[PDB]
């Protein structure tokens, strides 16, 4: 708040203006970064009341309604794990809740309509049938999945459970 210093500082030109502009540009960019990653859906997709996906359990990645934040079990774990001199911090345009909503829309879209919602209208398809298409994609015939549906669902469900156990432990 020194006037004597301020008057001397003016004699150095526009250095301060350049510095303010550089930091402002960064701050704006940070919102652009978040928008580009998460806001890839024009609609907010919801999962069905009845979670019947042919034995495939997604309870660890879907929002848990008992939490005020409406985060999944895994997300909640991730969040728990991680002025006098004219210095300030600005808030993000999107809140953590809004980002969580974008993520859940992406999950709901994938589970109920596969990849169709990412290239047009969301077209419903039975989850087991979606997986069958994905098996074809990797050069495995559909019948391999249908004849091993219980095994595949079990391997999937166990793998997801392991993810939570790993994250909660490895520091």
């Amino acid at each position: 708040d020194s006037t004597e210093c301020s008057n001397l500082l003016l004699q150095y030109g526009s250095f301060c203006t350049q510095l303010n502009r550089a930091l402002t540009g960064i701050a704006v960019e940070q919102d652009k970064n978040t928008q580009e990653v998460f806001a890839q859906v024009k609609q907010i997709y919801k999962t069905p009341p009845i979670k019947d996906f042919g034995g495939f359990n997604f309870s660890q990645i879907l929002p848990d309604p008992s939490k005020p934040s409406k985060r999944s079990p895994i997300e909640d774990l991730l969040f728990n794990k991680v002025k006098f001199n004219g210095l300030t911090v600005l808030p993000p345009l999107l809140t953590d809740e809004m980002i969580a909503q974008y993520t859940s829309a992406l999950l709901a879209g994938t589970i109920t309509s596969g990849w169709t919602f990412g290239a047009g209208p969301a077209l419903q398809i039975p989850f087991p049938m979606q997986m069958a298409y994905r098996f074809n994609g990797i050069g495995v015939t559909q019948n391999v999945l249908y004849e091993n549906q219980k095994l595949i669902a079990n391997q999937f469900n166990s793998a997801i459970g392991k993810i939570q156990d790993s994250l909660s432990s490895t520091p």
């Binding site: 169709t116 290239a119 047009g120 209208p121 077209l123 398809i125 039975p126 087991p128 049938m129 069958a132 559909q142 019948n143 249908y146």
Partner: peptide, 13 residues
Amino acid sequence: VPAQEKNFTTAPA
């Protein structure tokens, strides 16, 4: 871009 979808009943086999 896909358009004008309709509902059908399906089966795995």
